[PDB]
Amino acid sequence: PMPPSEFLDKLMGKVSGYDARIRPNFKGPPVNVTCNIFINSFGSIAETTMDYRVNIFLRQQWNDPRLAYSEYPDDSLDLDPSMLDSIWKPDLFFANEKGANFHEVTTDNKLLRISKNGNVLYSIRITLVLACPMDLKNFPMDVQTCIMQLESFGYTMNDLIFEWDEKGAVQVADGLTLPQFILKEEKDLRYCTKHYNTGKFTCIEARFHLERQMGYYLIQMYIPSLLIVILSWVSFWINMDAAPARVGLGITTVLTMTTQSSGSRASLPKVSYVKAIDIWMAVCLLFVFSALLEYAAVNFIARQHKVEEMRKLFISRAKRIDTVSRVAFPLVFLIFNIFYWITYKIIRSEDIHKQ
Amino acid sequence: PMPPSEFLDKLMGKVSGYDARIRPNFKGPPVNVTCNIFINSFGSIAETTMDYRVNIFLRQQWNDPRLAYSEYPDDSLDLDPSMLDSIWKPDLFFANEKGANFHEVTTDNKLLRISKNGNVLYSIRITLVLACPMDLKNFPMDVQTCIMQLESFGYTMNDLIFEWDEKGAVQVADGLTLPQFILKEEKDLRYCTKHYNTGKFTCIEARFHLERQMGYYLIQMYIPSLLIVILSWVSFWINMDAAPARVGLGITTVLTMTTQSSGSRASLPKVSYVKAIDIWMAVCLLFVFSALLEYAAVNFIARQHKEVEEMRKLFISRAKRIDTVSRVAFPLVFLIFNIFYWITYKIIRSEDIHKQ
Amino acid sequence: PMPPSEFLDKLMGKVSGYDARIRPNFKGPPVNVTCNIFINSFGSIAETTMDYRVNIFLRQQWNDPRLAYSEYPDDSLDLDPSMLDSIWKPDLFFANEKGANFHEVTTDNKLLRISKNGNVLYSIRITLVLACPMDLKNFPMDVQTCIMQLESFGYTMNDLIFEWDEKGAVQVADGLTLPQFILKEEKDLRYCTKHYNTGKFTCIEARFHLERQMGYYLIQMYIPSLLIVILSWVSFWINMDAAPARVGLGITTVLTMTTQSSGSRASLPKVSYVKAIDIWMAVCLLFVFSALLEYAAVNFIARQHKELEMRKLFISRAKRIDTVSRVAFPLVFLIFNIFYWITYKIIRSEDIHKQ
Amino acid sequence: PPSEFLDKLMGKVSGYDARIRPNFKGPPVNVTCNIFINSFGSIAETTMDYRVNIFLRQQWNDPRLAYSEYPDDSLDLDPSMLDSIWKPDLFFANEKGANFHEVTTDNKLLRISKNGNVLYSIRITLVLACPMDLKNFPMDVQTCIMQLESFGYTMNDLIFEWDEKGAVQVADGLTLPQFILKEEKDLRYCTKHYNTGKFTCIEARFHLERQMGYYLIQMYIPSLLIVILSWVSFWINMDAAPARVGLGITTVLTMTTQSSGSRASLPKVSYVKAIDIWMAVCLLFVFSALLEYAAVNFIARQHKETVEEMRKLFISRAKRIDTVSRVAFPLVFLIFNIFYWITYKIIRSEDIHKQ
Amino acid sequence: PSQLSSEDLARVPANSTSNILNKLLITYDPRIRPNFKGIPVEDRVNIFINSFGSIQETTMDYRVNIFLRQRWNDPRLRLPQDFKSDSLTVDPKMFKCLWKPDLFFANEKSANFHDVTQENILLFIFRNGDVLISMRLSVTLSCPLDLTLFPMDTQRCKMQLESFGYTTDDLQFMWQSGDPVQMDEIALPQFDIKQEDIEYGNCTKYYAGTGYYTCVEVIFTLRRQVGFYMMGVYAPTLLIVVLSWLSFWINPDASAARVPLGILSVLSLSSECTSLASELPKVSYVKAIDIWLIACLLFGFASLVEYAVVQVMLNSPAAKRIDLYARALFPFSFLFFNVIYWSVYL
Ligand SMILES: CC[C@H](C)[C@H]1O[C@]2(CC[C@@H]1C)C[C@@H]1C[C@@H](C/C=C(\C)[C@@H](O[C@H]3C[C@H](OC)[C@@H](O[C@H]4C[C@H](OC)[C@@H](O)[C@H](C)O4)[C@H](C)O3)[C@@H](C)/C=C/C=C3\CO[C@@H]4[C@H](O)C(C)=C[C@@H](C(=O)O1)[C@]34O)O2
Ligand SMILES: CC[C@H](C)[C@H]1O[C@]2(CC[C@@H]1C)C[C@@H]1C[C@@H](C/C=C(\C)[C@@H](O[C@H]3C[C@H](OC)[C@@H](O[C@H]4C[C@H](OC)[C@@H](O)[C@H](C)O4)[C@H](C)O3)[C@@H](C)/C=C/C=C3\CO[C@@H]4[C@H](O)C(C)=C[C@@H](C(=O)O1)[C@]34O)O2
Ligand SMILES: CC[C@H](C)[C@H]1O[C@]2(CC[C@@H]1C)C[C@@H]1C[C@@H](C/C=C(\C)[C@@H](O[C@H]3C[C@H](OC)[C@@H](O[C@H]4C[C@H](OC)[C@@H](O)[C@H](C)O4)[C@H](C)O3)[C@@H](C)/C=C/C=C3\CO[C@@H]4[C@H](O)C(C)=C[C@@H](C(=O)O1)[C@]34O)O2
Ligand SMILES: CC[C@H](C)[C@H]1O[C@]2(CC[C@@H]1C)C[C@@H]1C[C@@H](C/C=C(\C)[C@@H](O[C@H]3C[C@H](OC)[C@@H](O[C@H]4C[C@H](OC)[C@@H](O)[C@H](C)O4)[C@H](C)O3)[C@@H](C)/C=C/C=C3\CO[C@@H]4[C@H](O)C(C)=C[C@@H](C(=O)O1)[C@]34O)O2
Ligand SMILES: *[C@@H]1O[C@H](CO)[C@@H](O)[C@H](O)[C@H]1NC(C)=O
């Protein structure tokens, strides 16, 4: 009955005497803010810069006593986004954020709702670039923990306290599929209170567990690496007295393999610890490099002969090495392959336990 | 006993007569401002553009006699961040800044606290793309000093003087482990007053020492170079008359070193002095190149006999002795080079460590 | 004893009657503006886009009769930077400017000082990416002139005239060192008045002479090119009948030299003239191609004996070709090296005379 | 006095409504447009766009803004006053990202004549979209398009006209690095029809010609060297299978990299370009070089299979193929070259007629 | 301007927006929606495609420039028969003082308005009260891509228009009855865009604790042009296979000749595969182009393994049968693969 416009002015207005500068319940118990997050999109995870981008809906709930209304029967009246300036809002901000911006497509992407008891609901559409320190050992098979830190710049824990919502704290949009990662459904909600010389400030943290899909890594690096090792083994069936042919084969494989190893570092950041792709690349280089010395020994042993019995002995030894190599080289690679994967599988299992 | 709104108007309000345009203690002693630095995030050091990025909290403290209150018994008051626009705030700009922005993720990221005596505590979240000159004389095993300069643009030292807080000037976060650098605990705090035609202006400087981590360069640069040098020595066991194989081996090793050296310079700026990595690559390139010359000599000596039998045997024996000595000398001389190269750079670094 | 707040309204106030819209000395002689720049940082020179970035302090001085004060006995009164909004300021802008911005790191980086006579000092901190056309006839060892043009958009020569300051028009920061260029200590200050359809406008220009450093280019392109040439020469000592070795040696050097030339153009614009580096890369390619070309003549001459004592003469001719080549190719290269450097040095002196 | 007049012309007393167009409920207002091109560059094939820095001038008679009391005509106003006057809503329909400069002040001009004519000049930087026809890619002419349309006012309110004299003006000494800007510019009327109605639009076309210096030195000459290198094989010994086959394969592989490199810059188009014809024929010639030795090796070995007289015939057959090829391959390349360069010059002549 | 009925309004002009618009907006509150506490508003939406392009595969997005049209009946904004014209074409600056729906693109990555010389907005007010607001927007939408069948694939890219603050009880979005998406005569470099667009609609979103929200979606069908990859990928790989067959004519005893021919052919194809991966995102599934590259590598690999068998047979103490058969079958087997491959992918 009473006009809608008057209610906007009569409440939280100059006549009302509401002061947006003064927090609710001044000189009293700390304000308690419950927070929700809805993840619209997750992606753009970059190892080089150690950051990821996310688009979220940040919802906050708090109780302002000065905003209670009994004149209108309806509850949870939606307000206008343009009048949010005069509403008192908590100074939440992201500790690990590197770049954030609001969204203004047609109007401001903001929602404000006020219930009769004074409860306030305020949701914003934000895009976050968040810093994520990464441990890049076990690089191909690595679970990565991403964190989001929400803490208060200006209000101490005597005035503003942040808590996670009981039901549906972090909610993920339906059918959200990361390109090269898998996001686990278990989310860790922790308290990490911050202490500064200025004082103590409230902080809440949400942790995401990301598993790396290994389809791409097998096709583009592991399988090509297998070819270079196998192609090197072709030399063991080439004639013994084919020094241009066999050495040329050896050099091309070894040098191509080094370029393939150099290809991997392009995207990775410059780190000073050994990774799992290094242990693969190092052993692969050892196998091709040992093939070159295999022919070098055969060539040297053959010429060592310079009565007739001596050349029979030396020539047999060079031939024997090639026949032994034809089985020894594939066999040792098989032993290494079995040990490599099982060792790295049990580690990955423990990674799930560590989450 | 006083409503909060009324106190906000009675002090620093229009009725109060506080003009933020005039500095405290006008026509009097210079305003003294204390400064603090909390390093929230350090990283993105880029050699090519010779800059680094940093996320910090900047706290300034200055005594304003006008902003004094006796109505409220509390020692301090956490005022609203939005009302800073009517506060007199000292001008502070960074002399070596190439880019900066404020943070407006949800609200204004600033803190204002006013004490009873009139002290003001004013804290800001800033992201700075600062520029640091880098020596690069010894690209591996170097220590770099970054600079942060805090100075005033409009107020001279007769009016505004900037100092460093006595306790805890620079405060690093709990972790903040840089991927490529190690940040030393000791930080130098110095005064570097600036003089211009406009006048004399105050300035304070904080220097950070960063030591480059050697793990990445050993695995991805030195070890690949070592492999090619060893690969070259394989030519001293192949047949003496196998011209396509040995020449093919020699050329492929030398050319690979050139591409490896070319790869290294890409990430570096176009400086015009010789770096430590250059000396390594040059000597390694010298070794592999000398291997090719070794085959050239033995090839010429071997066929020299045709150009009776006694001369032929002597030349072939002369040719073979080159191979025997080469397969021993070339590893050994490289070994001797490695001892000299590493030992000198360590003593050089250790003396520089004292300087840094 | 005048209050500071009250005095600041007696000038630049509603009571004052000062209109910032109307220029000083309306309907009268032109306003004389003296300008200074302080070079705080120089760098980011980019050949590909033909621009450079500079951070400067721009100071301006003009006499405003209205801003005359007598109550305060101070020779000058430094004023708050915020006051700049209420004072007439000339509309200076840069004609070669691609992008420029102000700095608001903590406060506006501006300085205003007013003297008793009415002089005004107005210093601004600006960072500008300036366009510089470049002449790359000699890609190294050239002198590039970078200009800065300061002109007025809306005020004609009848109202606003710009002048350089008699002393210290351009001042450079202490210890400024460009990484790949050397900045000369002599800067030419000239006048270039502009005429458009809308009238005549004042403009002042300051040009900087930058000299490229040769230290980088010598150890990264000239020495590598010299290595490829000297590598080709060893073929003259390789056995005459070893066709796979020498032919493989000849082709590999020529192809690698081609790649080295391609590497040089990565950082250069797609210019249609001939650069100095092109002459070096062409001559180096000419030498290595000739070495391969020589072997084809030796092979053709050598096989003639079997197809056709005639045997001895054909074999003798082939050996003499190799023997002369071992001294001809080094010597002819040496003559080229002497000619190439000395001719361009006198060209460098001529360009130094032209600044 | 100056200050009082500005209020009188457009102020609270004046009642000048900036929201009503001139000659309301009457004939459309006439708009005369000028363009001065201060900078032309950043022509990128990949994104099919170019960047321009221009001064945009508009003239429209406003009857309300007529002054008789000041004797002087065309008195220049302050740039800040532009908020008060009614200004047409020009925009560039084919544009991508626009920005004002505000380097030290707003780069704007305002002039008002006694009769009421208004002149409003602004400095703009524009990234405009240019569709490109990449057929005849090294020898092509590209027409750039600049469209000025009115977004809010239909043909009853706002009509656009080009200035009779000096519509598009180019700054003195403007030299595009990669293109030659012709001095003839086409101005047409292209009215746009939408579901809202008819809106005025004017278009100015720039005719650009690509400089051929860069592509000759960097693409055609390197390609013509690999072809010649292939011909060296025709002099190497027939029995030298490792040499000629090695030489053959290296040239073919090197040509393949060059062809891919040539297309790296320009976009992924689905039509055949001029550069593709050249690279294809070059690939055909080097491939035919590899395919001629294979026929000579096979024809020779057939002697082993009058056994001696069988041997002679086969050996002669092999030599004849090599001798004929030595003159045949250069001759066919020459005939292709003259055909290739004549037809494209003819097509280029037709293209300039279209321009 | 015009806020709180333009303050005193002492000025007295004659029958202009100084009078009509101010009288129209004397009691107008933009904060209160039309038909407050009643029927939800029905907002007709149209799109005009100025420029479609920049379909980036690395970031799986595309950038479009469009004009957004909206229509809604405003009971308060009724022309009081003062003007016999059915339109007002008021100044574009007035958009700030009137109610506007809070439309936002849910799948959008970055958006910007455009300020060439003025705000690029059109406002129309019909006599009945209907409002037509037009706006120039440049939006970077996000498109998930399925890169199986990669060289010859079809991709559906959507555009979702939904409200942020008003639920389905207050604000409802629907597509215009006739010609909702008026495209322009445009051409794409690497893709082909059809004129048949699926106006799916619905898309109504439910968010826990806030309620239902209206949405409308337009799906664009894009077909890739296969011409570029013919010259770019298929033809180079087909060439390298042909060189591999050349070894079968080279002398059986030419170890230093055939072996480089085999190894350099295999390694050349492998490098070509790596270059293709650079443009494509790091997907974990196989693509159509891969089955081509695997077979080409298999044929290249089988050439070198063929010579190794010949070298064993010659030194085993004939081997000409192995070479002679290889010359016929190796081209022949490749022909069958091509027939099956292209037929399967049409
Ligand atoms: C020993 C070198 C000769 C030339 C041998 O090289 C090869 C072939 C045969 C030659 C005889 C190939 C070579 C590896 C070696 C075998 C080496 C290993 C299997 C490991 O290495 C050891 C040595 C290393 O000490 C430098 C030692 O210190 C550590 C200490 C710390 O850990 C406790 C660690 O924090 C610190 C950073 O480092 C550590 C025990 O790891 C394995 C990790 C090797 C990795 C090397 C490479 C992977 O990709 C690189 C590059 O992109 C490429 C092109 C070539 C690779 C290569 O060249 O790999 C490469 O450089 O064999
Ligand atoms: C001639 C080609 C045969 C294959 C010869 O090539 C080689 C070796 C032996 C073969 C017989 C190598 C070749 C150069 C030639 C020798 C050529 C020169 C020493 C110069 O060139 C002449 C020819 C040129 O005409 C196109 C001629 O016109 C001018 C006219 C105008 O000025 C008046 C000018 O505005 C216009 C644009 O051009 C002009 C007199 O300059 C010298 C400048 C050569 C430059 C070429 C190259 C440098 O880097 C390029 C590329 O990055 C690379 C990978 C290979 C180089 C190469 O391939 O260099 C390269 O392409 O010898
Ligand atoms: C057929 C290949 C065999 C193996 C022959 O290949 C070679 C050497 C000898 C082998 C017997 C080399 C090969 C070309 C052929 C000769 C071919 C031509 C002179 C033309 O080509 C044909 C093929 C083309 O589509 C492959 C075909 O369809 C058109 C249809 C439509 O137009 C009507 C068009 O909309 C659509 C896009 O394309 C059309 C009939 O024109 C000429 C235009 C060739 C261009 C090919 C290339 C140029 O740069 C490419 C690449 O960067 C590189 C590394 C290799 C080149 C190559 O590999 O070139 C390359 O791929 O000879
Ligand atoms: C077997 C490889 C040898 C070296 C053969 O390589 C070649 C030729 C002949 C050699 C004998 C060439 C090679 C492909 C293979 C044929 C391989 C396939 C048709 C597929 O592969 C299989 C094997 C794979 O297990 C290694 C197997 O996954 C396991 C583990 C899984 O657990 C997570 C489990 O889910 C599953 C059940 O089982 C799985 C069935 O996929 C196919 C997916 C491979 C494509 C590879 C390539 C295409 O572009 C790549 C690269 O850019 C390039 C440079 C070279 C290519 C290449 O190298 O192509 C390349 O790497 O033949
Ligand atoms: C508006 O009013 C004026 C006089 O006040 C009148 O002349 C004019 O015709 C009116 N316009 C209409 C009725 O459309």
Author numbering:
A (entry chain D): 31 to 336, 396 to 444
B (entry chain C): 31 to 337, 396 to 444
C (entry chain B): 31 to 338, 398 to 444
D (entry chain A): 33 to 337, 395 to 444
E (entry chain E): 40 to 356, 466 to 494
What does the primary publication say about this deposited structure?
Glycine receptors (GlyRs) are chloride-conducting, pentameric ligand-gated ion channels (pLGIC) primarily found in spinal cord neurons where they mediate fast inhibitory neurotransmission. The majority of adult GlyRs are composed of α1 and β subunits. Here we report three structures of full-length zebrafish (ZF) heteromeric GlyR composed of α1 and βΒ subunits absent of any exogenous fiduciary markers.
To further explore conformational heterogeneity within αβGlyR, an additional structure was solved in the presence of 1 mM glycine and 20 μM ivermectin (αβGlyR-Gly-Ivm at 2.98 Å). Unexpectedly, our structure shows clear ivermectin densities at all five subunit interfaces. The larger side chain of βI333 forces ivermectin away from the primary subunit. The αβGlyR-Gly-Ivm pore conformation is similar to αβGlyR-Gly but has a distinct desensitization gate. P-2’ of αΑ is moved up and towards the pore axis. This creates a gate that is both more symmetric and constricted with a radius along the minor axis of 1.6 Å. We thus conclude that αβGlyR-Gly-Ivm is also in a desensitized conformation.
